[PDB]
Amino acid sequence: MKQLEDKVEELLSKNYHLENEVARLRSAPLLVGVVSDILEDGRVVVKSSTGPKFVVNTSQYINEEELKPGARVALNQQTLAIVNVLP
Amino acid sequence: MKQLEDKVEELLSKNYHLENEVARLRSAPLLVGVVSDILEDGRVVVKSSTGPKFVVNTSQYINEEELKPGARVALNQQTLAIVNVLP
Amino acid sequence: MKQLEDKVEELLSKNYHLENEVARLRSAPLLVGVVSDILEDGRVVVKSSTGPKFVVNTSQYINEEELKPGARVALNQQTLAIVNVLP
Amino acid sequence: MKQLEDKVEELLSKNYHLENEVARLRSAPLLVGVVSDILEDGRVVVKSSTGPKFVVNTSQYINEEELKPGARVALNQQTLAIVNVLP
Amino acid sequence: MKQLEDKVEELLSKNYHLENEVARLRSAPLLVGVVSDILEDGRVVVKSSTGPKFVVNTSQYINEEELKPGARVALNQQTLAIVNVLP
Amino acid sequence: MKQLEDKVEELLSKNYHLENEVARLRSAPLLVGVVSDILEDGRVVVKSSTGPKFVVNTSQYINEEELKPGARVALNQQTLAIVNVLP
């Protein structure tokens, strides 16, 4: 009876850890690129590490100061919006 | 008690499904890549052998000790999550 | 008169939907390319930064004056239509 | 009352221009390539600007005289059929 | 006899559908490639002009005599099956 | 009456040959690659002729003796499992 309660307790735990592993493995990546140049309208041209250059939007939370040519950026994989500026 | 045994069956069933899901996510074929650098928040930049660079998540069962620049890694193909460090 | 006001509501609704459709089509992310040459019928050959060359349509709101060989352009990703000339 | 009629008139106009813009942005591109060689059966081998070489059909409206090696051609994007010979 | 004529209509119908299916599978556009080598079991290794190498099947109507290393071939795009040897 | 029976006979034949041609043209290819290195767990790292390196499974029927670096291998096109070792 306390045996069960224990099993319920470790099962809950194992299940929580497995869910977490699922969440981590399923989370979408971001795509790395380099800022090529900033446009008069606040859209940025990025060179994707996939090859092409794109005109993309930028996260409202990004300090636009940090967006300058040569800056390494991380892009949403579908919309290619700048999500982070990277070191 | 009948309730506990029921809860144990349920959680075991849940566990079973979670394990199968983690196994699929971790299963081959996996894309090979190379760790490029590690971010303060614990996400990793990897270069995939397909060419581009990504910011990715990692399995919680990786040995962080081996997880460093130049390390060869095995990536889930859909998300590019780091599933194993390789030699 | 009741008919006119109705017709205005209708046409305004239609206008609204058309504006949203044009905005999506013109919205980022856009692929960067370079005008290669201009055809007698007014279609343009562009080289996309993805590599290949295409014969494409153009937005009617482009300034034809800037639309010339070597001009950097912003392309709809699906159709490769020229949406903006860039500097 | 003449106010409405006017609004109906400019709305019709604006809506026509927007439709046109939609039509232009949605129209499919053609893919540029170069004629590599002509086959005994009237199928042409084309080098796509996307990289590979293909055996393709030609439009019935094309003067087959103009199809010779080195000729720049424009291809339907799905079937890769020669739609135009370009300057 | 009524049964025979019926069986002939049926088999002719079947034939018709089969012929159409073979024509689609053999129809342009076809990818160009180069035979790389021939395997004991009669499957062929081809290099596609898209880059990679494949082990593929072949049409039964190919002249085996022309089917040899360096031979230029025409590949079904979906399966990469050898549909024609080209000059 | 024997005329029909004959037509039924050749139709059956033609139909069998056409089916066969369909089967050959529809059969999936295998993708060529080169064994890069063998892993402690029996998963192999293969360099695909498509470019990237992958961690893949191997057919239970493959003599694992033959799997060594530089070995040319043929891969299932979806799972990238080693199906054959090639000369």
Side-chain angles (χ1 to χ4, degrees), chain C residues 4-5 8 11 15 21 26 37 43 53-55 57-61 79, chain D residues 4 8 15 17-18 20-21 24-27 29-30 32 49 72 84:
Chain C
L4 281 153
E5 288 175 316
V8 169
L11 294 175
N15 183 269
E21 200 173 1
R26 293 180 54 82
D37 52 78
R43 301 166 313 162
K53 306 192 197 65
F54 297 82
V55 173
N57 221 318
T58 59
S59 164
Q60 71 204 353
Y61 305 118
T79 62
Chain D
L4 297 200
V8 163
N15 291 355
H17 282 112
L18 286 171
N20 199 89
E21 181 76 347
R24 295 157 81 110
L25 288 187
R26 279 196 194 288
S27 84
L30 303 173
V32 175
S49 53
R72 193 163 71 154
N84 302 145

PDB file of all heavy atoms in Angstrom, chain C residues 4-5 8 11 15 21 26 37 43 53-55 57-61 79, chain D residues 4 8 15 17-18 20-21 24-27 29-30 32 49 72 84:
ATOM      1  N   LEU C   4     -26.634  51.958 -52.980  1.00  0.00           N
ATOM      2  CA  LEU C   4     -25.295  52.546 -53.034  1.00  0.00           C
ATOM      3  C   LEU C   4     -24.469  52.308 -51.768  1.00  0.00           C
ATOM      4  O   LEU C   4     -23.269  52.025 -51.849  1.00  0.00           O
ATOM      5  CB  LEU C   4     -25.363  54.060 -53.316  1.00  0.00           C
ATOM      6  CG  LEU C   4     -25.613  54.346 -54.803  1.00  0.00           C
ATOM      7  CD1 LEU C   4     -26.324  55.679 -54.963  1.00  0.00           C
ATOM      8  CD2 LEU C   4     -24.337  54.311 -55.639  1.00  0.00           C
ATOM      9  N   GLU C   5     -25.099  52.467 -50.608  1.00  0.00           N
ATOM     10  CA  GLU C   5     -24.382  52.393 -49.337  1.00  0.00           C
ATOM     11  C   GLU C   5     -23.995  50.956 -49.097  1.00  0.00           C
ATOM     12  O   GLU C   5     -22.936  50.660 -48.522  1.00  0.00           O
ATOM     13  CB  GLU C   5     -25.246  52.889 -48.184  1.00  0.00           C
ATOM     14  CG  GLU C   5     -25.455  54.411 -48.172  1.00  0.00           C
ATOM     15  CD  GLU C   5     -26.433  54.881 -47.083  1.00  0.00           C
ATOM     16  OE1 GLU C   5     -27.499  54.245 -46.917  1.00  0.00           O
ATOM     17  OE2 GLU C   5     -26.128  55.892 -46.408  1.00  0.00           O
ATOM     18  N   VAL C   8     -21.110  50.300 -51.364  1.00  0.00           N
ATOM     19  CA  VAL C   8     -19.890  50.836 -50.802  1.00  0.00           C
ATOM     20  C   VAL C   8     -19.359  49.913 -49.689  1.00  0.00           C
ATOM     21  O   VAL C   8     -18.131  49.766 -49.533  1.00  0.00           O
ATOM     22  CB  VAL C   8     -20.061  52.321 -50.326  1.00  0.00           C
ATOM     23  CG1 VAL C   8     -18.848  52.815 -49.470  1.00  0.00           C
ATOM     24  CG2 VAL C   8     -20.257  53.233 -51.548  1.00  0.00           C
ATOM     25  N   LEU C  11     -17.807  46.847 -51.530  1.00  0.00           N
ATOM     26  CA  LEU C  11     -16.554  47.155 -52.181  1.00  0.00           C
ATOM     27  C   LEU C  11     -15.482  47.492 -51.165  1.00  0.00           C
ATOM     28  O   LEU C  11     -14.308  47.229 -51.395  1.00  0.00           O
ATOM     29  CB  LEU C  11     -16.741  48.309 -53.138  1.00  0.00           C
ATOM     30  CG  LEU C  11     -17.640  48.046 -54.346  1.00  0.00           C
ATOM     31  CD1 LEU C  11     -17.813  49.359 -55.116  1.00  0.00           C
ATOM     32  CD2 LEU C  11     -17.045  47.051 -55.245  1.00  0.00           C
ATOM     33  N   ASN C  15     -12.115  45.546 -50.804  1.00  0.00           N
ATOM     34  CA  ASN C  15     -10.868  46.292 -50.728  1.00  0.00           C
ATOM     35  C   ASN C  15     -10.032  45.809 -49.546  1.00  0.00           C
ATOM     36  O   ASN C  15      -8.828  45.572 -49.664  1.00  0.00           O
ATOM     37  CB  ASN C  15     -11.179  47.791 -50.556  1.00  0.00           C
ATOM     38  CG  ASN C  15      -9.940  48.647 -50.535  1.00  0.00           C
ATOM     39  OD1 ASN C  15      -9.384  48.905 -49.480  1.00  0.00           O
ATOM     40  ND2 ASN C  15      -9.474  49.041 -51.700  1.00  0.00           N
ATOM     41  N   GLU C  21      -4.325  40.568 -48.577  1.00  0.00           N
ATOM     42  CA  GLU C  21      -3.693  39.684 -49.542  1.00  0.00           C
ATOM     43  C   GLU C  21      -2.443  40.328 -50.147  1.00  0.00           C
ATOM     44  O   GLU C  21      -1.391  39.707 -50.193  1.00  0.00           O
ATOM     45  CB  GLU C  21      -4.688  39.298 -50.615  1.00  0.00           C
ATOM     46  CG  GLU C  21      -4.315  38.069 -51.368  1.00  0.00           C
ATOM     47  CD  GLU C  21      -5.429  37.583 -52.346  1.00  0.00           C
ATOM     48  OE1 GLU C  21      -6.513  38.231 -52.443  1.00  0.00           O
ATOM     49  OE2 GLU C  21      -5.202  36.545 -53.023  1.00  0.00           O
ATOM     50  N   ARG C  26       3.581  40.721 -50.188  1.00  0.00           N
ATOM     51  CA  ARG C  26       4.687  41.648 -50.194  1.00  0.00           C
ATOM     52  C   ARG C  26       5.476  41.527 -48.899  1.00  0.00           C
ATOM     53  O   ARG C  26       6.534  42.124 -48.760  1.00  0.00           O
ATOM     54  CB  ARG C  26       4.141  43.079 -50.347  1.00  0.00           C
ATOM     55  CG  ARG C  26       3.479  43.397 -51.696  1.00  0.00           C
ATOM     56  CD  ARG C  26       2.941  44.834 -51.827  1.00  0.00           C
ATOM     57  NE  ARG C  26       3.979  45.823 -51.543  1.00  0.00           N
ATOM     58  CZ  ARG C  26       4.900  46.243 -52.413  1.00  0.00           C
ATOM     59  NH1 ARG C  26       4.923  45.801 -53.666  1.00  0.00           N
ATOM     60  NH2 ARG C  26       5.816  47.113 -52.027  1.00  0.00           N
ATOM     61  N   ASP C  37      18.512  40.934 -66.490  1.00  0.00           N
ATOM     62  CA  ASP C  37      18.134  41.718 -67.628  1.00  0.00           C
ATOM     63  C   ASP C  37      16.623  41.806 -67.764  1.00  0.00           C
ATOM     64  O   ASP C  37      15.889  41.174 -67.016  1.00  0.00           O
ATOM     65  CB  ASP C  37      18.834  41.250 -68.904  1.00  0.00           C
ATOM     66  CG  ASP C  37      18.679  39.785 -69.154  1.00  0.00           C
ATOM     67  OD1 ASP C  37      17.586  39.429 -69.623  1.00  0.00           O
ATOM     68  OD2 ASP C  37      19.639  39.010 -68.903  1.00  0.00           O
ATOM     69  N   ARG C  43       8.775  41.432 -68.393  1.00  0.00           N
ATOM     70  CA  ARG C  43       9.184  40.470 -67.378  1.00  0.00           C
ATOM     71  C   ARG C  43      10.688  40.603 -67.171  1.00  0.00           C
ATOM     72  O   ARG C  43      11.397  41.133 -68.021  1.00  0.00           O
ATOM     73  CB  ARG C  43       8.794  39.054 -67.778  1.00  0.00           C
ATOM     74  CG  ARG C  43       7.244  38.815 -68.008  1.00  0.00           C
ATOM     75  CD  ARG C  43       7.005  37.465 -68.739  1.00  0.00           C
ATOM     76  NE  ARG C  43       7.908  37.307 -69.912  1.00  0.00           N
ATOM     77  CZ  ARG C  43       8.199  36.159 -70.547  1.00  0.00           C
ATOM     78  NH1 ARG C  43       7.639  35.013 -70.149  1.00  0.00           N
ATOM     79  NH2 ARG C  43       9.060  36.169 -71.584  1.00  0.00           N
ATOM     80  N   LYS C  53      18.484  31.310 -61.849  1.00  0.00           N
ATOM     81  CA  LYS C  53      17.935  32.478 -62.484  1.00  0.00           C
ATOM     82  C   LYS C  53      16.505  32.175 -62.881  1.00  0.00           C
ATOM     83  O   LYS C  53      16.184  31.028 -63.208  1.00  0.00           O
ATOM     84  CB  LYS C  53      18.758  32.886 -63.721  1.00  0.00           C
ATOM     85  CG  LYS C  53      20.234  33.085 -63.453  1.00  0.00           C
ATOM     86  CD  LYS C  53      20.940  33.768 -64.627  1.00  0.00           C
ATOM     87  CE  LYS C  53      22.469  33.602 -64.562  1.00  0.00           C
ATOM     88  NZ  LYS C  53      22.903  32.171 -64.714  1.00  0.00           N
ATOM     89  N   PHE C  54      15.673  33.227 -62.856  1.00  0.00           N
ATOM     90  CA  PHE C  54      14.249  33.098 -63.118  1.00  0.00           C
ATOM     91  C   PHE C  54      13.764  34.243 -63.951  1.00  0.00           C
ATOM     92  O   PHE C  54      14.350  35.330 -63.914  1.00  0.00           O
ATOM     93  CB  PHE C  54      13.426  33.144 -61.835  1.00  0.00           C
ATOM     94  CG  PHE C  54      13.706  32.038 -60.914  1.00  0.00           C
ATOM     95  CD1 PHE C  54      14.802  32.099 -60.059  1.00  0.00           C
ATOM     96  CD2 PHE C  54      12.910  30.905 -60.915  1.00  0.00           C
ATOM     97  CE1 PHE C  54      15.085  31.064 -59.196  1.00  0.00           C
ATOM     98  CE2 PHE C  54      13.185  29.857 -60.056  1.00  0.00           C
ATOM     99  CZ  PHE C  54      14.271  29.936 -59.185  1.00  0.00           C
ATOM    100  N   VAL C  55      12.662  33.989 -64.648  1.00  0.00           N
ATOM    101  CA  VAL C  55      11.964  35.010 -65.339  1.00  0.00           C
ATOM    102  C   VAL C  55      10.748  35.292 -64.526  1.00  0.00           C
ATOM    103  O   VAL C  55       9.938  34.397 -64.286  1.00  0.00           O
ATOM    104  CB  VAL C  55      11.529  34.593 -66.783  1.00  0.00           C
ATOM    105  CG1 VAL C  55      10.613  35.717 -67.409  1.00  0.00           C
ATOM    106  CG2 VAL C  55      12.753  34.328 -67.627  1.00  0.00           C
ATOM    107  N   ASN C  57       7.651  38.127 -62.722  1.00  0.00           N
ATOM    108  CA  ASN C  57       6.826  39.246 -62.787  1.00  0.00           C
ATOM    109  C   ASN C  57       7.335  40.296 -61.807  1.00  0.00           C
ATOM    110  O   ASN C  57       8.336  40.085 -61.123  1.00  0.00           O
ATOM    111  CB  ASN C  57       5.421  38.804 -62.465  1.00  0.00           C
ATOM    112  CG  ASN C  57       4.418  39.466 -63.344  1.00  0.00           C
ATOM    113  OD1 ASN C  57       4.509  40.677 -63.612  1.00  0.00           O
ATOM    114  ND2 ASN C  57       3.436  38.699 -63.786  1.00  0.00           N
ATOM    115  N   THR C  58       6.676  41.449 -61.775  1.00  0.00           N
ATOM    116  CA  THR C  58       7.089  42.546 -60.908  1.00  0.00           C
ATOM    117  C   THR C  58       5.852  43.184 -60.315  1.00  0.00           C
ATOM    118  O   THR C  58       4.804  43.141 -60.905  1.00  0.00           O
ATOM    119  CB  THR C  58       7.747  43.661 -61.682  1.00  0.00           C
ATOM    120  OG1 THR C  58       6.788  44.086 -62.629  1.00  0.00           O
ATOM    121  CG2 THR C  58       8.971  43.197 -62.413  1.00  0.00           C
ATOM    122  N   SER C  59       5.998  43.810 -59.160  1.00  0.00           N
ATOM    123  CA  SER C  59       4.901  44.603 -58.585  1.00  0.00           C
ATOM    124  C   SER C  59       4.655  45.797 -59.521  1.00  0.00           C
ATOM    125  O   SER C  59       5.587  46.310 -60.124  1.00  0.00           O
ATOM    126  CB  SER C  59       5.304  45.110 -57.182  1.00  0.00           C
ATOM    127  OG  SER C  59       4.454  46.162 -56.731  1.00  0.00           O
ATOM    128  N   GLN C  60       3.424  46.255 -59.615  1.00  0.00           N
ATOM    129  CA  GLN C  60       3.155  47.458 -60.383  1.00  0.00           C
ATOM    130  C   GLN C  60       3.632  48.726 -59.724  1.00  0.00           C
ATOM    131  O   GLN C  60       3.652  49.756 -60.359  1.00  0.00           O
ATOM    132  CB  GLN C  60       1.682  47.588 -60.707  1.00  0.00           C
ATOM    133  CG  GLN C  60       0.761  47.933 -59.548  1.00  0.00           C
ATOM    134  CD  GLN C  60      -0.660  47.469 -59.827  1.00  0.00           C
ATOM    135  OE1 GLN C  60      -0.968  47.013 -60.928  1.00  0.00           O
ATOM    136  NE2 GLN C  60      -1.523  47.575 -58.839  1.00  0.00           N
ATOM    137  N   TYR C  61       4.060  48.653 -58.479  1.00  0.00           N
ATOM    138  CA  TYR C  61       4.426  49.844 -57.725  1.00  0.00           C
ATOM    139  C   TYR C  61       5.925  49.966 -57.640  1.00  0.00           C
ATOM    140  O   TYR C  61       6.441  50.553 -56.728  1.00  0.00           O
ATOM    141  CB  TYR C  61       3.848  49.808 -56.303  1.00  0.00           C
ATOM    142  CG  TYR C  61       2.355  49.621 -56.259  1.00  0.00           C
ATOM    143  CD1 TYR C  61       1.795  48.495 -55.640  1.00  0.00           C
ATOM    144  CD2 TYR C  61       1.490  50.556 -56.848  1.00  0.00           C
ATOM    145  CE1 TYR C  61       0.406  48.318 -55.587  1.00  0.00           C
ATOM    146  CE2 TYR C  61       0.101  50.381 -56.816  1.00  0.00           C
ATOM    147  CZ  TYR C  61      -0.433  49.265 -56.170  1.00  0.00           C
ATOM    148  OH  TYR C  61      -1.809  49.050 -56.107  1.00  0.00           O
ATOM    149  N   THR C  79       6.805  32.774 -55.574  1.00  0.00           N
ATOM    150  CA  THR C  79       6.743  33.066 -57.033  1.00  0.00           C
ATOM    151  C   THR C  79       7.977  33.747 -57.619  1.00  0.00           C
ATOM    152  O   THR C  79       8.128  33.859 -58.821  1.00  0.00           O
ATOM    153  CB  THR C  79       5.619  33.996 -57.361  1.00  0.00           C
ATOM    154  OG1 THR C  79       5.838  35.233 -56.682  1.00  0.00           O
ATOM    155  CG2 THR C  79       4.252  33.414 -56.992  1.00  0.00           C
TER     156      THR C  79
ATOM    157  N   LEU D   4     -21.572  59.001 -52.835  1.00  0.00           N
ATOM    158  CA  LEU D   4     -21.541  57.547 -52.902  1.00  0.00           C
ATOM    159  C   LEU D   4     -21.079  57.111 -54.279  1.00  0.00           C
ATOM    160  O   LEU D   4     -20.010  56.504 -54.412  1.00  0.00           O
ATOM    161  CB  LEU D   4     -22.907  56.930 -52.577  1.00  0.00           C
ATOM    162  CG  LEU D   4     -23.408  57.194 -51.154  1.00  0.00           C
ATOM    163  CD1 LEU D   4     -24.450  56.171 -50.823  1.00  0.00           C
ATOM    164  CD2 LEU D   4     -22.303  57.213 -50.072  1.00  0.00           C
ATOM    165  N   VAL D   8     -18.046  54.581 -54.934  1.00  0.00           N
ATOM    166  CA  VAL D   8     -18.191  53.345 -55.664  1.00  0.00           C
ATOM    167  C   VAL D   8     -17.221  53.298 -56.844  1.00  0.00           C
ATOM    168  O   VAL D   8     -16.729  52.240 -57.220  1.00  0.00           O
ATOM    169  CB  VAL D   8     -19.635  53.175 -56.158  1.00  0.00           C
ATOM    170  CG1 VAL D   8     -19.740  52.120 -57.267  1.00  0.00           C
ATOM    171  CG2 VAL D   8     -20.556  52.842 -54.975  1.00  0.00           C
ATOM    172  N   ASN D  15      -9.814  48.600 -56.141  1.00  0.00           N
ATOM    173  CA  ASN D  15      -9.968  47.157 -56.113  1.00  0.00           C
ATOM    174  C   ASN D  15      -9.401  46.494 -57.381  1.00  0.00           C
ATOM    175  O   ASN D  15      -8.760  45.422 -57.314  1.00  0.00           O
ATOM    176  CB  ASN D  15     -11.425  46.752 -55.890  1.00  0.00           C
ATOM    177  CG  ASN D  15     -11.927  47.079 -54.471  1.00  0.00           C
ATOM    178  OD1 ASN D  15     -11.179  47.528 -53.617  1.00  0.00           O
ATOM    179  ND2 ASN D  15     -13.212  46.854 -54.234  1.00  0.00           N
ATOM    180  N   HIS D  17      -6.924  47.672 -59.209  1.00  0.00           N
ATOM    181  CA  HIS D  17      -5.480  47.776 -59.140  1.00  0.00           C
ATOM    182  C   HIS D  17      -4.870  46.778 -58.179  1.00  0.00           C
ATOM    183  O   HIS D  17      -3.792  46.263 -58.440  1.00  0.00           O
ATOM    184  CB  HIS D  17      -5.034  49.188 -58.733  1.00  0.00           C
ATOM    185  CG  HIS D  17      -5.091  50.166 -59.857  1.00  0.00           C
ATOM    186  ND1 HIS D  17      -5.989  51.211 -59.892  1.00  0.00           N
ATOM    187  CD2 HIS D  17      -4.414  50.212 -61.024  1.00  0.00           C
ATOM    188  CE1 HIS D  17      -5.841  51.877 -61.020  1.00  0.00           C
ATOM    189  NE2 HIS D  17      -4.892  51.291 -61.724  1.00  0.00           N
ATOM    190  N   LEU D  18      -5.564  46.531 -57.068  1.00  0.00           N
ATOM    191  CA  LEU D  18      -5.124  45.588 -56.080  1.00  0.00           C
ATOM    192  C   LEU D  18      -5.169  44.148 -56.648  1.00  0.00           C
ATOM    193  O   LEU D  18      -4.177  43.397 -56.512  1.00  0.00           O
ATOM    194  CB  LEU D  18      -5.975  45.707 -54.824  1.00  0.00           C
ATOM    195  CG  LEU D  18      -5.714  46.924 -53.940  1.00  0.00           C
ATOM    196  CD1 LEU D  18      -6.788  47.026 -52.841  1.00  0.00           C
ATOM    197  CD2 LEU D  18      -4.338  46.922 -53.339  1.00  0.00           C
ATOM    198  N   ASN D  20      -4.864  43.321 -59.583  1.00  0.00           N
ATOM    199  CA  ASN D  20      -3.887  43.229 -60.598  1.00  0.00           C
ATOM    200  C   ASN D  20      -2.581  42.925 -59.937  1.00  0.00           C
ATOM    201  O   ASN D  20      -1.794  42.096 -60.426  1.00  0.00           O
ATOM    202  CB  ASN D  20      -3.808  44.599 -61.280  1.00  0.00           C
ATOM    203  CG  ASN D  20      -3.171  44.540 -62.624  1.00  0.00           C
ATOM    204  OD1 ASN D  20      -3.865  44.327 -63.624  1.00  0.00           O
ATOM    205  ND2 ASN D  20      -1.843  44.777 -62.673  1.00  0.00           N
ATOM    206  N   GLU D  21      -2.351  43.633 -58.822  1.00  0.00           N
ATOM    207  CA  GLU D  21      -1.162  43.417 -58.033  1.00  0.00           C
ATOM    208  C   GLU D  21      -1.148  41.975 -57.488  1.00  0.00           C
ATOM    209  O   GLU D  21      -0.137  41.306 -57.552  1.00  0.00           O
ATOM    210  CB  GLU D  21      -1.078  44.426 -56.912  1.00  0.00           C
ATOM    211  CG  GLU D  21       0.175  44.290 -56.037  1.00  0.00           C
ATOM    212  CD  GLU D  21       1.389  44.820 -56.687  1.00  0.00           C
ATOM    213  OE1 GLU D  21       1.294  45.067 -57.902  1.00  0.00           O
ATOM    214  OE2 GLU D  21       2.428  44.999 -55.990  1.00  0.00           O
ATOM    215  N   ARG D  24      -0.183  39.729 -60.392  1.00  0.00           N
ATOM    216  CA  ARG D  24       1.242  39.798 -60.717  1.00  0.00           C
ATOM    217  C   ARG D  24       2.124  39.112 -59.683  1.00  0.00           C
ATOM    218  O   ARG D  24       3.148  38.530 -60.033  1.00  0.00           O
ATOM    219  CB  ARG D  24       1.705  41.254 -60.878  1.00  0.00           C
ATOM    220  CG  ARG D  24       1.065  41.988 -62.079  1.00  0.00           C
ATOM    221  CD  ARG D  24       1.100  43.515 -61.890  1.00  0.00           C
ATOM    222  NE  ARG D  24       2.422  43.981 -62.259  1.00  0.00           N
ATOM    223  CZ  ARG D  24       2.723  44.704 -63.332  1.00  0.00           C
ATOM    224  NH1 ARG D  24       1.792  45.143 -64.169  1.00  0.00           N
ATOM    225  NH2 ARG D  24       3.985  44.999 -63.559  1.00  0.00           N
ATOM    226  N   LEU D  25       1.737  39.163 -58.417  1.00  0.00           N
ATOM    227  CA  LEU D  25       2.610  38.619 -57.403  1.00  0.00           C
ATOM    228  C   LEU D  25       2.456  37.095 -57.309  1.00  0.00           C
ATOM    229  O   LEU D  25       3.392  36.394 -56.876  1.00  0.00           O
ATOM    230  CB  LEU D  25       2.377  39.296 -56.060  1.00  0.00           C
ATOM    231  CG  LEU D  25       2.879  40.739 -55.970  1.00  0.00           C
ATOM    232  CD1 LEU D  25       2.775  41.316 -54.557  1.00  0.00           C
ATOM    233  CD2 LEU D  25       4.277  40.816 -56.457  1.00  0.00           C
ATOM    234  N   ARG D  26       1.296  36.595 -57.725  1.00  0.00           N
ATOM    235  CA  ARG D  26       0.999  35.169 -57.652  1.00  0.00           C
ATOM    236  C   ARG D  26       1.412  34.362 -58.900  1.00  0.00           C
ATOM    237  O   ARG D  26       1.524  33.154 -58.843  1.00  0.00           O
ATOM    238  CB  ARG D  26      -0.480  34.963 -57.418  1.00  0.00           C
ATOM    239  CG  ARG D  26      -0.947  35.118 -55.979  1.00  0.00           C
ATOM    240  CD  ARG D  26      -2.355  34.502 -55.840  1.00  0.00           C
ATOM    241  NE  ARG D  26      -2.958  34.906 -54.596  1.00  0.00           N
ATOM    242  CZ  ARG D  26      -2.570  34.457 -53.409  1.00  0.00           C
ATOM    243  NH1 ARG D  26      -1.594  33.544 -53.305  1.00  0.00           N
ATOM    244  NH2 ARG D  26      -3.161  34.917 -52.311  1.00  0.00           N
ATOM    245  N   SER D  27       1.632  35.037 -60.017  1.00  0.00           N
ATOM    246  CA  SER D  27       1.980  34.376 -61.272  1.00  0.00           C
ATOM    247  C   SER D  27       3.288  33.608 -61.158  1.00  0.00           C
ATOM    248  O   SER D  27       4.240  34.033 -60.503  1.00  0.00           O
ATOM    249  CB  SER D  27       2.012  35.385 -62.447  1.00  0.00           C
ATOM    250  OG  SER D  27       3.240  36.084 -62.587  1.00  0.00           O
ATOM    251  N   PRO D  29       6.808  31.802 -61.808  1.00  0.00           N
ATOM    252  CA  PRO D  29       7.958  32.129 -62.626  1.00  0.00           C
ATOM    253  C   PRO D  29       8.319  31.059 -63.640  1.00  0.00           C
ATOM    254  O   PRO D  29       7.816  29.950 -63.589  1.00  0.00           O
ATOM    255  CB  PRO D  29       9.073  32.165 -61.616  1.00  0.00           C
ATOM    256  CG  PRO D  29       8.701  31.090 -60.621  1.00  0.00           C
ATOM    257  CD  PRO D  29       7.192  31.218 -60.516  1.00  0.00           C
ATOM    258  N   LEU D  30       9.262  31.394 -64.493  1.00  0.00           N
ATOM    259  CA  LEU D  30       9.882  30.449 -65.365  1.00  0.00           C
ATOM    260  C   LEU D  30      11.282  30.376 -64.925  1.00  0.00           C
ATOM    261  O   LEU D  30      11.839  31.322 -64.397  1.00  0.00           O
ATOM    262  CB  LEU D  30       9.808  30.866 -66.834  1.00  0.00           C
ATOM    263  CG  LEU D  30       8.379  31.116 -67.380  1.00  0.00           C
ATOM    264  CD1 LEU D  30       8.347  31.692 -68.815  1.00  0.00           C
ATOM    265  CD2 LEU D  30       7.624  29.872 -67.319  1.00  0.00           C
ATOM    266  N   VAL D  32      15.216  29.659 -65.719  1.00  0.00           N
ATOM    267  CA  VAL D  32      16.146  29.833 -66.802  1.00  0.00           C
ATOM    268  C   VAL D  32      17.111  28.666 -66.915  1.00  0.00           C
ATOM    269  O   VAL D  32      17.590  28.137 -65.927  1.00  0.00           O
ATOM    270  CB  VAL D  32      16.941  31.154 -66.630  1.00  0.00           C
ATOM    271  CG1 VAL D  32      18.028  31.285 -67.712  1.00  0.00           C
ATOM    272  CG2 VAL D  32      15.976  32.329 -66.610  1.00  0.00           C
ATOM    273  N   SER D  49      19.486  26.288 -64.614  1.00  0.00           N
ATOM    274  CA  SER D  49      20.289  27.179 -63.775  1.00  0.00           C
ATOM    275  C   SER D  49      20.248  26.681 -62.338  1.00  0.00           C
ATOM    276  O   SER D  49      21.126  27.011 -61.567  1.00  0.00           O
ATOM    277  CB  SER D  49      19.799  28.631 -63.833  1.00  0.00           C
ATOM    278  OG  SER D  49      18.402  28.748 -63.547  1.00  0.00           O
ATOM    279  N   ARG D  72      19.739  30.351 -74.530  1.00  0.00           N
ATOM    280  CA  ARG D  72      19.170  30.593 -73.232  1.00  0.00           C
ATOM    281  C   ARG D  72      17.665  30.352 -73.334  1.00  0.00           C
ATOM    282  O   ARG D  72      17.045  30.897 -74.218  1.00  0.00           O
ATOM    283  CB  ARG D  72      19.484  32.015 -72.789  1.00  0.00           C
ATOM    284  CG  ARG D  72      19.187  32.247 -71.309  1.00  0.00           C
ATOM    285  CD  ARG D  72      19.845  33.482 -70.722  1.00  0.00           C
ATOM    286  NE  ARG D  72      19.201  34.680 -71.238  1.00  0.00           N
ATOM    287  CZ  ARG D  72      19.155  35.860 -70.631  1.00  0.00           C
ATOM    288  NH1 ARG D  72      19.686  36.041 -69.434  1.00  0.00           N
ATOM    289  NH2 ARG D  72      18.550  36.866 -71.237  1.00  0.00           N
ATOM    290  N   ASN D  84       9.949  29.646 -73.720  1.00  0.00           N
ATOM    291  CA  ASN D  84      10.474  30.771 -74.498  1.00  0.00           C
ATOM    292  C   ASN D  84      11.924  30.517 -74.758  1.00  0.00           C
ATOM    293  O   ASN D  84      12.629  29.941 -73.909  1.00  0.00           O
ATOM    294  CB  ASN D  84      10.520  32.091 -73.718  1.00  0.00           C
ATOM    295  CG  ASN D  84       9.195  32.536 -73.177  1.00  0.00           C
ATOM    296  OD1 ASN D  84       9.173  33.107 -72.120  1.00  0.00           O
ATOM    297  ND2 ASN D  84       8.095  32.320 -73.896  1.00  0.00           N
TER     298      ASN D  84
END
